[PDB]
């Protein structure tokens, strides 16, 4: 018989299977549609989630009650050292899909991507890309052959880049390689740009700017084998139940004489790949710049790094992106920041934000101070310092 109270579906079925991702680095399953009139630029970037903080800024939303009034929006910081280009990749169109035809590398690869190519670096002779560096050997005859193949063919072109993990405070030492699509006219111009940028670095200032809406692509935090109640949001059964209440009661009807794919069972929660869209950039900052955390209104020389550092990550000594809200992944995870695919026009976008203050108080507790100078002024002299 029928359900007796028509309630809605627990969980989303288009996020199935709720299984573990194949890697910590989530796949970019789409890049923006190419416009063969604009300059040549990257469509995405690679960074590491550092953490969160608090932001004051004045709202510019007319009709809202709180127009020209302050708000305290939250932000995620993604430390984003310059991404270095080591390869060029060419894809041609087939009735079975886009297919890689060939891929060209740089002459000198760093000991980070060379590290990526190994599972045991301490034992190895470190023989990788040696015969390729020897394939260059006078002018790059075979290399220009391959680039000419890419120019002739290659509906689209992708650049292989990697991260400066050593500049990042992680203990990993092994960089994250990724293919990033190039957008701009003339696959010839694309591949010439790549050849010019081989061995060279690329910073977020060229790829992202203020007030740009982006998508964030990462692997969700893992929580292991979880029960149906926290994994799907099922109602707990009453207190009076024999054999558990933190369960689903009816696991399907008699007929079909099967458990359906659509009933909630237990399993893996987290470590899924997720793509969250339309997160606005609030700051594109530079580790070269002292006073990253300063503002036109504040005028105090301070980095974004809180007192005691970002918890479980460290300090920020590189460039960074302060992006609105909450972004998938936990601290230290590689995040792929993608430019938006569609042109948004909503007045939530197109809203030029001007920050007013940045919280740089310690996140390792209830921080009361933003700078040690503030602390020293408030407290005075201590037994120490004396």
């Amino acid at each position: 018989s029928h359900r007796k109270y028509e309630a809605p579906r627990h969980g989303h079925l288009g996020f199935l299977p709720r299984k573990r991702a194949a890697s910590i680095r989530a796949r970019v399953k789409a890049f923006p549609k190419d416009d063969r009139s604009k300059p040549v630029a990257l469509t995405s970037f690679l960074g590491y989630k550092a953490g969160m903080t608090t932001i004051v800024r004045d709202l510019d939303r007319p009709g809202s009650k709180f127009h020209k009034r302050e708000v305290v929006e939250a932000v995620t910081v993604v430390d984003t050292p310059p991404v270095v280009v080591v390869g060029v990749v060419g894809y041609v169109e087939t009735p079975r899909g886009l297919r890689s035809l060939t891929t060209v590398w740089a002459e000198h690869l760093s000991d980070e991507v060379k590290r990526r190519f190994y599972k045991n670096w301490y034992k190895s002779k470190k023989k990788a890309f040696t015969k390729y560096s020897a394939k260059y050997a006078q002018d790059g005859a075979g290399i220009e052959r391959e680039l000419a193949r890419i120019k002739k063919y290659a509906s689209v072109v992708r650049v292989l880049v990697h991260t400066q993990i050593r500049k990042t405070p992680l203990a990993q030492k092994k960089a994250h390689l990724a293919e990033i699509q190039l957008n701009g006219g003339s696959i010839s111009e694309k591949v010439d740009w790549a050849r010019e940028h081989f061995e060279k670095t690329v910073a977020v200032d060229s790829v992202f700017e203020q007030n740009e809406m982006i998508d964030a692509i990462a692997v969700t935090k893992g929580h292991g084998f979880e029960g149906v109640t926290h994994r799907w949001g099922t109602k707990k059964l009453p207190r009076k139940t024999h054999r558990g209440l933190r369960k689903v009661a009816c696991i399907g009807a008699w007929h079909p004489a099967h458990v359906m794919w659509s009933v909630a069972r237990a399993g893996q929660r987290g470590y899924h790949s997720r793509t969250s869209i339309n997160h606005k950039i609030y700051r594109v900052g530079k580790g070269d710049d002292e006073a990253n955390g300063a503002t036109s209104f504040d005028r105090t020389k301070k980095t974004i790094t809180p007192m005691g550092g970002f918890v479980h990550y460290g300090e920020i000594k590189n460039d960074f992106i302060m992006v609105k809200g909450c972004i998938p992944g936990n601290r230290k995870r590689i995040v792929t920041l993608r430019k938006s695919l569609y042109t948004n026009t909503s007045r939530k976008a197109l809203e030029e934000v001007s920050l007013k203050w940045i919280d740089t108080a310690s996140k390792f507790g209830k921080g009361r101070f933003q700078t040690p100078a503030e602390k020293h002024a408030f407290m005075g002299t201590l037994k120490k310092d004396l």
Binding site: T54, V56, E70, K356, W357, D359, A361, K366, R368, T381
Partner: protein, 67 residues
């Protein structure tokens, strides 16, 4: 943007941080944290809590250079 003061402790309250309790008298109390909030609800006296600005003022501790 403004920096408020904790009624109990005297600590600076930066934005998005702390609580505000409106009493039936319509007297507004501000707290940096649940510590000062809980001691207030317990109805303790800041002049007797030793880590407080009122205590340190009333006992002439550390300041010594303003008055």
């Amino acid at each position: 943007m403004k920096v408020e003061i904790d009624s109990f402790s005297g600590a600076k309250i930066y934005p998005g941080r702390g609580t505000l309790f409106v009493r039936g008298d319509s007297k507004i109390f501000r707290f940096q944290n649940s510590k000062s909030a809980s001691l207030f609800k317990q109805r303790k006296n800041p002049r007797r809590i030793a880590w407080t600005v009122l205590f340190r003022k009333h006992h002439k501790k550390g300041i010594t250079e303003e008055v």
